[PDB]
Amino acid sequence: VHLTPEEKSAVTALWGKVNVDEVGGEALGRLLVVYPWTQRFFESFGDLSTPDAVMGNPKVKAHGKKVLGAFSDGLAHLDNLKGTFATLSELHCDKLHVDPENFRLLGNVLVCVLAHHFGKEFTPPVQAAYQKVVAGVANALAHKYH
Amino acid sequence: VHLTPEEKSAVTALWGKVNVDEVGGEALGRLLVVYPWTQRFFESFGDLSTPDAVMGNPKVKAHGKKVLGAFSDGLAHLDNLKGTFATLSELHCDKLHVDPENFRLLGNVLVCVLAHHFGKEFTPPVQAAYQKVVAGVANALAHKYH
Amino acid sequence: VLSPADKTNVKAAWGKVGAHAGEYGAEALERMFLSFPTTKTYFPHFDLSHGSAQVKGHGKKVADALTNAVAHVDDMPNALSALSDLHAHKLRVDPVNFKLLSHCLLVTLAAHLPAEFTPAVHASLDKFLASVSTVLTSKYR
Amino acid sequence: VLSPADKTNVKAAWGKVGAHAGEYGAEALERMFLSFPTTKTYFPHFDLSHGSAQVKGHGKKVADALTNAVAHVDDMPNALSALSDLHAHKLRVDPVNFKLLSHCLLVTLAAHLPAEFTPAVHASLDKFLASVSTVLTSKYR
Ligand code: HEM
Numbered sequence: 001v002h003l004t005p006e007e008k009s010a011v012t013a014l015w016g017k018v019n020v021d022e023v024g025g026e027a028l029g030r031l032l033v034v035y036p037w038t039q040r041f042f043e044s045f046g047d048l049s050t051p052d053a054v055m056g057n058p059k060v061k062a063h064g065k066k067v068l069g070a071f072s073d074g075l076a077h078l079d080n081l082k083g084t085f086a087t088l089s090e091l092h093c094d095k096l097h098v099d100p101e102n103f104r105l106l107g108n109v110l111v112c113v114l115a116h117h118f119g120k121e122f123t124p125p126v127q128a129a130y131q132k133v134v135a136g137v138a139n140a141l142a143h144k145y146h
Numbered sequence: 147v148h149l150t151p152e153e154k155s156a157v158t159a160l161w162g163k164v165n166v167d168e169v170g171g172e173a174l175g176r177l178l179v180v181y182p183w184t185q186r187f188f189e190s191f192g193d194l195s196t197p198d199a200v201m202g203n204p205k206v207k208a209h210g211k212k213v214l215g216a217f218s219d220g221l222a223h224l225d226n227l228k229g230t231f232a233t234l235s236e237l238h239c240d241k242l243h244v245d246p247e248n249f250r251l252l253g254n255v256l257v258c259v260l261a262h263h264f265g266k267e268f269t270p271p272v273q274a275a276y277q278k279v280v281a282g283v284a285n286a287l288a289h290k291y292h
Numbered sequence: 293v294l295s296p297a298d299k300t301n302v303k304a305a306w307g308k309v310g311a312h313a314g315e316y317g318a319e320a321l322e323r324m325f326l327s328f329p330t331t332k333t334y335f336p337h338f339d340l341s342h343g344s345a346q347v348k349g350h351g352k353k354v355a356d357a358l359t360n361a362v363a364h365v366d367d368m369p370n371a372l373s374a375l376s377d378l379h380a381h382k383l384r385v386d387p388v389n390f391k392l393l394s395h396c397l398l399v400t401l402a403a404h405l406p407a408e409f410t411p412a413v414h415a416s417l418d419k420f421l422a423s424v425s426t427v428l429t430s431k432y433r
Numbered sequence: 434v435l436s437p438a439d440k441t442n443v444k445a446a447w448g449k450v451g452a453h454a455g456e457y458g459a460e461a462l463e464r465m466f467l468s469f470p471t472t473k474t475y476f477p478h479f480d481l482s483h484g485s486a487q488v489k490g491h492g493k494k495v496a497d498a499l500t501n502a503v504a505h506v507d508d509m510p511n512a513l514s515a516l517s518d519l520h521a522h523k524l525r526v527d528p529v530n531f532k533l534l535s536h537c538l539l540v541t542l543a544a545h546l547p548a549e550f551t552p553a554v555h556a557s558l559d560k561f562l563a564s565v566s567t568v569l570t571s572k573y574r
C-alpha cells in the first residue's frame with residue numbers, strides 16, 4: 001500500500017492518541033452488530049442477542065483489545081504488513097476458518113469508529129489514508145490463505 | 147501476479163490454441179450483453195440494443211481483437227503486468243474515464259468464453275490459473291488510476 | 293427488510309442531519325473521491341476540487357434524495373423510482389460504487405454526530421443505505 | 434427482475450443440466466474451491482480433495498436446489514424460504530461468495546452446454562443466479 005509520506009504522518013499522528021482498549025471493543029462490537037452474521041465465529045462469547053448485549057459483552061470487549069493491539073503492530077510496520085501478520089494469517093485460515101472478506105468489513109467498521117471518535121479531525125484525507133491502511137492489513141491477513 | 151510453473155505452463159499451453167479473431171470479440175461482446183451498462187463506453191460502435199446486434203457487430207469483433215491482443219502481451223509478461231499495461235491504464239483513466247471495475251467483469255466474462263471455446267479441456271485447475279491471470283490484468287490496468 | 297427499529301433509528305439519525313444537507317452530502321462525495329478515486333471516472337465533467345460548486349450542489353441533491361427516502365422509508369421503490377431510471381439508463385454506474393458511497397455517508401454521519409451514531413443506529417443506517425443502493429440499481433438489466 | 438425471455442432461457446438451458454445435475458453441481462463446487470480458495474473456509478468439516486464424495490454429495494444438493502428454483506422461477510422468494518433461513522441464521526456465508534459460486538456455475542454450464550450457452554442465455558442465467566443469491570441473503574439482517 002502506498003501511503004504518501006504525509007499519509008504516513010497522518011496515520012501515525014492520529015494513532016498515537018488512540019485508546020486501543022476502547023477502540024478495539026467498539027470496532028469488534030459494531031462488526032458483530034452491523035453484520036450480525038459475523039457472530040458465527042463467536043458463539044463462545046456469550047450474550048450477543050442485542051446491540052447492548054454485544055457492546056457491553058466483556059468477551060467481545062477483551063477480544064477486541066487483542067485485535068486492535070495486533071493492528072497497532074501493523075501500524076508500526078507499514079512497510080511490511082504481510083510479514084507482520086503472517087502468523088495471524090495462517091491461524092485465521094487453518095485454525096479459525098475465517099473468510100478474509102470479514103477483514104474488509106472490520107477495516108471499514110474501524111474507519112467508522114475512528115471518525116466517530118475523532119470527529120472533524122478525521123478529515124477526508126485522513127480517512128483516505130486509513131482506507132489504505134485497513135485495506136493493507138486485510139490483504140496482509142488474507143495473504144497466507146490457501 | 148504469482149503463478150507457479152505448473153500454472154504458467156497450463157496457461158501458455160491453452161492460450162496457444164486460442165482463436166485470436168474470435169475469442170476477443172466474443173468476450174467483449176458478451177460483456178455488453180450481460181452487463182449492458184458497459185455499452186455506455188461504446189456508443190460510437192452503433193447498434194448494441196440486442197444480443198445479435200452486439201455480437202454480430204464488426205466494430206465489436208475488431209475491437210475485441212485489439213483487446214485480446216493486449217491480453218496476449220500479458221500472458222508473456224506475468225512477472226511485470228504493470229509496465230505492460232501502465233500506458234493503457236493511464237489511457238482508460240485519463241481519457242476514457244472507464245471504471246476499472248469493468249476490467250474485472252470482462253476478465254470473468256473471458257473465463258466463461260474460454261470455458262465455452264474449450265469445453266472439458268477447461269478444467270478447474272486451468273480455470274484457477276486463468277482467474278489469477280485476468281485478476282492480474284485488471285489490477286495492472288487499474289494501477290495508474292487516480 | 294428494514295425492521296421497525298430500523299426506520300425509527302434512521303429517522304432520528306437523519307433528522308439530526310437537519311439543514312446540514314448539502315454540507316454532509318458534499319463531504320461524503322469528497323470523502324468518496326479521495327478514498328476511492330475510481331469513483332471519479334463518473335464525474336469527468338465535474339470540478340472535483342475542494343468545495344467546488346458542482347459537488348456542493350450535487351451533494352445537496354444526494355442529501356435531499358436520502359431525506360425523501362427516509363420520509364418514504366416504507367415505500368422507497370416508489371419514491372426513488374425516477375432516480376432508479378437515471379442511474380440505470382443514463383449514468384450507468386457500476387453497482388460496486390454504491391457501497392463505496394454508503395460507506396462515505398456512514399463516515400460523515402459518524403464524524404458529525406458523536407451522540408446519534410450508536411451501534412444500533414449505525415447498523416440501521418448501513419441497512420437503509422444498502423436498501424437505497426438496491427433500488428437505485430434495480431433497473432440495470 | 435427476470436423477464437419472460439429470461440425465464441424461458443433458464444428453463445430451457447437448465448433442462449440439459451437436468452440429468453448430470455450431480456456432476457455439474459460438484460464440478461462448480463470444485464472450480465469455486467480452486468479458483469477462489471477463501472470459499473473453502475465454509476467447508477472445514479468437508480473433504481475437499483478432488484473427486485471427494487462429500488463434494489459430489491453436496492454438489493447434487495446445490496444443483497437440485499437450483500432445479501427447484503428454476504421450476505418456481507415466479508415464486509423464488511417463497512420457494513426458497515427454508516434455504517434462505519439456513520444460509521442467514523445457520524451458515525451465515527458472506528454474500529460476496531455467492532457471486533463466486535455463480536460465476537463458477539456459469540463456467541460449468543459454458544463448458545458443458547456450448548449450444549445452449551448463448552450470449553443471451555448467458556445473460557439470463559447470470560440474472561437468474563444473481564436473484565437466487567439475493568433471496569438466499571435476504572434474511573441476514
Ligand atoms: C483487523 C483484523 C484482525 C486482526 C488484526 C485480528 C487479530 C486476531 C488476534 C490477535 C486474535 C487472537 C489469536 C489467539 O487467540 O491466539 C484473533 C482471534 C480471532 N479472530 Fe481475528 N483478527 C482480525 C479480524 C477478525 C475478524 C474480522 C474475524 C471474524 C469475524 C476474526 C475472528 C477471530 C476469531 C474467531 C478468533 C478466535 C477467537 C477466540 O479466541 O475464540 N478476526 N484475531
Ligand code: HEM
Pocket residue numbers: 184187188190212213216217234237238242244248249252253283284287
Ligand atoms: C481486458 C482489459 C482491457 C484491455 C486489455 C483493454 C485494452 C484496450 C486497448 C488496447 C484499447 C486501445 C487504445 C489505443 O488505441 O491505444 C482499448 C480501448 C478502449 N477500451 Fe479497453 N481494454 C480493457 C478493458 C476495457 C473495458 C472493460 C472497457 C469498458 C467497457 C474498455 C473500454 C475501452 C474503450 C471505450 C476504448 C476506446 C475505443 C474506441 O471507442 O475507439 N476497455 N482498450
Ligand code: HEM
Pocket residue numbers: 331334335350353354357358375378379383385389390391393394424425428
Ligand atoms: C447513495 C446513493 C446515491 C443517490 C441517493 C444518488 C442520487 C443522485 C441524484 C439525486 C442525482 C441527481 C439527479 C438529477 O436531478 O439530475 C444523481 C446524479 C448522479 N449520480 Fe448518483 N446517487 C447515489 C450514488 C451515486 C454513485 C454510486 C455514483 C457514481 C459513483 C453516482 C453517480 C452520479 C452521477 C454521475 C450523477 C450525475 C451528476 C451530474 O452530472 O449532475 N451516484 N445521483
Ligand code: HEM
Pocket residue numbers: 472473475476491494495498499516519524526530531532534535562565566569
Ligand atoms: C447458488 C447459491 C447456493 C445454493 C443455491 C446453495 C444451496 C445449498 C443447499 C441446498 C444446501 C443444503 C442444505 C440442506 O441440506 O437443506 C447448502 C448447504 C451449504 N451451503 Fe449453500 N448454496 C449456495 C451458495 C453457497 C455458498 C456461496 C457458500 C459459501 C461458499 C455456501 C455454503 C454452504 C454450506 C457450508 C453448506 C452446508 C454443507 C453441509 O454441511 O452439507 N452455499 N447450500
Ligand SMILES: O=P(O)(O)O[C@H]1[C@H](OP(=O)(O)O)[C@@H](OP(=O)(O)O)[C@H](OP(=O)(O)O)[C@@H](OP(=O)(O)O)[C@H]1OP(=O)(O)O
Pocket residue numbers: 001002082139147148285286289
Ligand atoms: O513485494 P511487494 O512490495 O509486496 O509488491 C508486490 C507488487 O509489486 P512487485 O511484485 O512489483 O514488487 C505490488 O505492490 P504495489 O506496487 O501495488 O505496492 C502488489 O500488487 P497490486 O498491484 O496487486 O497492488 C503486490 O501485492 P499487494 O498489492 O497486495 O501489496 C505485491 O505482491 P506480493 O506480495 O505477491 O509479492
